[PDB]
Every structure is written in structure tokens, then in C-alpha cells.
Amino acid sequence: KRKVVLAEQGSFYIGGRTVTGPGKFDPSKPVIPYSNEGATFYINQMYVNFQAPVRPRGLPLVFWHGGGLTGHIWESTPDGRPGFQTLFVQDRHTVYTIDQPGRGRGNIPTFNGPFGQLEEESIVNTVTGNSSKEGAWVRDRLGPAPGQFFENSQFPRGYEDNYFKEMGFSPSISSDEIVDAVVKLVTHIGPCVLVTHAASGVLGMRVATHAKNVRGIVAYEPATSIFPKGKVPEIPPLADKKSQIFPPFEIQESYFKKLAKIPIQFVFGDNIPKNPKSAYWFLDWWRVTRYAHSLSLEAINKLGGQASLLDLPTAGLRGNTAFPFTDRNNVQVASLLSDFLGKHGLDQN
Amino acid sequence: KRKVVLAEQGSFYIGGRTVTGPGKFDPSKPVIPYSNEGATFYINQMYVNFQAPVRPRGLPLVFWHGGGLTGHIWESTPDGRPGFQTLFVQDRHTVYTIDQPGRGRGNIPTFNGPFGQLEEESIVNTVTGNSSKEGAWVRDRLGPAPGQFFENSQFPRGYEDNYFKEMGFSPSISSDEIVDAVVKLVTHIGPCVLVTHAASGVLGMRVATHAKNVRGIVAYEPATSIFPKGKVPEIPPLADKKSQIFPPFEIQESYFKKLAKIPIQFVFGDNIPKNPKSAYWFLDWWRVTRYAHSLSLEAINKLGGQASLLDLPTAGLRGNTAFPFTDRNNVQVASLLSDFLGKHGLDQN
Ligand SMILES: COC(=O)c1ccccc1CS(=O)(=O)NC(=O)Nc1nc(OC)cc(OC)n1
Ligand SMILES: COC(=O)c1ccccc1CS(=O)(=O)NC(=O)Nc1nc(OC)cc(OC)n1
């Protein structure tokens, strides 16, 4: 179950740009304390890990963590069971896992001065935002309130601390530059499949419209829907009659139609309510967000696409959280990903 | 050369604490934008990756990156050659690599507000520091000035972008909390060997004084010297007759004497001058820092220890930078680490 045979493995940095401070660098002057004087800084580069099996079969997979996460979530579950990285190397795919710009081993662009500030220029905001444990508990649908689990939950109970410890803030790097890094990676890899999650869902869709090497997308519980510009459907507010879901991302129709040329699957876990739930904001948020994604997939299909929505309970998997790939049944979730890859020949050479 | 067979691999979080915001969390209220209200935040936890060979022998190795770095530097070289992780799994050791608190996949403690501030409390400083490409070039002795290489250089020339992209800032987490996280990892692992680098040199020495499971230390180009409290020898200023090296860390002699109970090796690369070099600040800095370390090792040996200094040129390896384990001859550098492990019985069951 745990053994892994790698023809090769490693990591590298890709993407990003440079910014420079004022003045010149004099090697005779004290280098420490570090100074912006004469400085070149590499910023917004992304970290990439790869593991290649012996005799790979089919396209490499690029696993793209959700918001505030890192490639760790594809390596192991919080209770230490194998993650999708191991599972799909065993399934004979070369596997890439990334830490996007601003997360984990990706760059956090800060310098000598207030966070994110290079002299008078603000590269990212000094004021940060970050979810609490409580916010993440309900966002991920462990249960309706912090410390409470749904009866059917597939969460690895007892490993809560390990789970929340993987989560953190993201600096205000432009989403354009995050997409740019992954487009450059896709150019480097060749034909591949993007496997996204939550906040990276919309980013992966954007990458596909810029990179024909993306031959398929599987998105686990994507957080932001995408529509052709000017063509966002009517989407209701939340049950509290004042909140809304994340504003849908709009792209030019000519780019949106590129999503119709590849197989795309959105995967949702359990315990998303069918009816308005004003008492549980993030449960109600998921209800309307999943609805919006269903309309997004229909728009892709009306343009000739191959887009589908997989509710895991309809496949007989009950209780999954918003991280199905680290839940107790993640081997069965991986089986369904293998099925999708096989259906579209993405597991053949 | 690149093939690797793993009995198991994965990653996990360990260490850290929690801090809390005021008030109570209400799941019916909008969870986004994120708020400190009723918040629990997990801070200062550390990321740990492991790869175990089939039929391990000897003690697991814990590779601990230098300042502003991550476990990446043990995975691959900037030009994509295998790092010590792969080399020592092939050498049949279980290999742990860490991203320490504040670096990479370790936690960066920040919240909703100015960087590092939780309401009125400063958890880490809002003002950051970070080396430039230019400062790192001379710090790591690629050459005497940015753009220049020493004649004998083992640096992977042409891969400067990859190399400097792996580097970044560290928030002002207390070193005590970084040491604490690794003490907990060492407690979890059992008897093990610490392999440190630059900034983690002094931190690994401290870990060993709190953790009898550390059975050996190899430190690559450590940045801060350590002495018993009140017994810091006279150390000269730098050639500019105004700068000093890093203030030596002082610990109680009852803890310092624990360093005499295990084999300890400091490894230095090439192009550290023998004579004062006022034109090249960081070259002179290394001259005096290496001298201070030589006095540190002597103090350990005067307490009955087995502490040695290995200059790679004396072993016939020329041109190494301050990252010998990612230089072009890093296989030969690894051979010398294997020799150390073998001599001291750390490669035996
Ligand atoms: C696993 O975590 C996620 O990636 C996730 C999952 C479910 C719902 C939302 C998210 C992303 S987040 O919770 O981190 N959102 C966030 O920080 N604020 C925020 N607010 C917006 O409203 C205008 C728009 C926006 O676009 C990404 N992000
Ligand atoms: C690979 O990089 C390193 O770890 C390294 C290598 C050689 C020299 C120094 C370092 C650490 S650092 O350069 O990042 N130092 C730093 O930010 N300032 C700073 N100043 C101090 O005394 C004034 C004390 C102090 O050690 C805790 N660090």
C-alpha cells in the first residue's frame, strides 16, 4: 500500500519576475543587516515537485492545492495515510505537485521594510487576511459548527490539529501572476492534466484557456465559478438575504470556448444542503456555489464541451468534506479520478 | 543514478501552539471576509517530509535547511541533479527533510491585520528583512562580487535564477520555538542524525543539548558559533575594523557538555581567505566565522568531545560554495558524509 518506485524525483522553481531597489551594491560594505540598496529580488516564483514512476502511462498530473494550502495535501492525509501523489504514482502517472506563488515553498514577496513593501512600492499588501480554525472548520464542512462533525463524516477524526496546521495566509499576489506561473509550468511539462481544489479551481480554468497543453481538468470543490463576460446567469443571494457567493470570474467568450475542447469534471463532497440554511452561512454558501458551478458547466456544454459534475454521494461515497482527497475514503475518491482519466484516454500513451 | 525505491513516504505537521482572537465565532454570520473574532490560530508549526528505503540501515537523517531556505535544497540542485534526499535514500537511510517554522511549508504567523499582528499583540514583526540576490551571491561565496565566479567554482553556473529563487524572508519567530519544534520531531523519530546548514547550525547544536536522541551532527558552513555562558573567547572584528561576526550564542555549561557526547563535524567549502580581506566583506566574515567555529569545536573537545572541522579542499574537493550539497561535486560531498556516518557506526542497525 505504501511502497513507491520512482524512476526519478526532484523539485525546481519556475516563473516569477524581479524587482530592484535603489542604488548600487558595494561588496566591501557590511552586507548584514540586509539592505534594499543595489538589491535584486526574485519574486512570485513557484515551487514544483515531481515524481515519475518507472514506465509512466498517460499524461502527467499537476496537483494544485486550494487556498491557503500547499502540496502537502497531496502527499499525505492529516492522519498520515498516502495522498494522491503516492496513489497516482502507483497508478503509473508522473505526478507534479506545486506550491503556488505566495504559498509554502513558493515566493512570499517581501523585503527590508514593512511587509510586502519595497521602498515606496507596494508589491503586496502589508495588511494580511487569514482564516481561523473555526472559519476553516465550517468552510470545509467537517460539521455545521466548529468542534462538531456530521454523523457521516469522512474526516480523519482525532487529527484536527494536524489538519488545520497545514493552512495559512496568502499575500495579495495578483491572480494573473499565479496563472502566469502555472502556464509556464504547463509549457515546460507538455500535455498534462490539472487537478485543482477550492481556490485553484478558477485559476486552473484560466490556465486551460491560455495553455492548450492542458488536456483535462478535475476540480475538487472549486470556490469561484467562471462564465463568459456579460453572460453571468442570475444567481440568488444566500439565505441571510444579504450575503452573496464569490463574484463569478468573467473571461472573453473566445477564451471561454477553449474550455469546451477538453474533458472537465467538478467533484463535490457531501452535506451540501439542498434548501436554504440561514443558520449555517458556509453550508448555504456551498449550496449556491455548487449551483453556480452547475450553470458554468452547462454554459461550457452548450458551446460543445465535455463538462460534468460528480456528486460523490451519487457514486455511493457518503460524508466527504471539501477535501475529499484527504478524507478517510480517499482511495475510493482516487478510484473515481482514475476512472475519469481512463474514460478520456488520459491514462494511455 | 536517479531511481529510488521507497518503502513509504509522506509528510506531516508537528509542533507549534495556538493564539486566539477575542469574542465568539457565530456560524450564521458571514465567514468571509475572514475575521479574528472568536478565532483560534495555529502558529509556528513545522512541516516534515520523510522517505524511507526498503531495508533501512543505521539511523534516520534529518536534513535542516539554512536561513531563508526550505527542504527543496536537499531534494534537487538548482540544475536538477539529485539532492542529498535521493542520495541518502539510495544509501539506505530513512531521510527526513523539514521546512522549519516561518519557512516554506512551515507556518508564517499572521492574521487579519498588519503582518504578524493579532489585535494589539505583535506575534512577529511587521517589518521584514530579506537578502538580495547580490547579498546572497557574496554570502554563499559564488564569487567575490555579484556576477563573478571564483576560478575553481563548483557552483552550477547558468542556473543562478533557479538558485536564488529558492531563497526568501523569515518572520521574527523566536529561535526557542524553532528549536522546540525540532526537539519534538527528534522525540518522535527516535535516535537520529542532524545534518544542518548555515543558520540551522546553531539551532541543531541547541537541539542536541535538549535531545539525547541526536546521536551525531554534520553542519555545513554554520553561521553562528556557540560557547558556554561566560566563556566566549576573544574574537577579532572584521578587516574593516568595525564589523563583527554574528554574536556567539551562549548556553549553560551543563547543556554545552552534552555536545561532547556525540560526534560533531563542521564542513566548510572553498575560497574562505586566510588573511584579512577588507575589500570583500562577506569573505572576511567567513574567515572570522570559521575561526570562531574552530574555537567552539576546541571547547567541545576540551570537555571530552569528538568535534572536528573538515575543510573540503583538504579532502581534495576544490571550489565548493557555502552550499556544498548542491554544488556540481555534491556526490563527492555526500561520500564524505557517508564516511562520517560509517566511521561512527551511524549506518549500522
Ligand atoms: C480551501 O480554501 C479555499 O480555497 C476556499 C474554499 C471554499 C471557499 C473559499 C475558499 C477561498 S478563501 O476562503 O480563502 N477566500 C478568501 O480568502 N477570500 C476571498 N473572498 C472573495 O470575495 C470577494 C473572493 C476570493 O477569491 C479567491 N477570496
Ligand atoms: C544560507 O543563509 C544563512 O543561513 C546565513 C549564512 C551565512 C551568514 C548568515 C546567514 C543568516 S542571515 O544572513 O539570514 N542573517 C540575518 O538575517 N541576520 C542575522 N543577524 C544576526 O546578527 C546581527 C544574527 C543572525 O542569526 C540569527 N541573523
From TrEMBL, chains A, B:
It comes from the Bacteria. Signal peptide: none annotated. Its EC number is 3.1.1.-. Residues 61-296 form the AB hydrolase-1 domain. InterPro entries: AB_hydrolase_1, AB_hydrolase_fold, Carboxylesterase_BioH, TAT_signal. PROSITE patterns: TAT. Keywords: Hydrolase. GO terms for molecular function: hydrolase activity. This is Alpha/beta fold hydrolase. It comes from Hansschlegelia zhihuaiae.
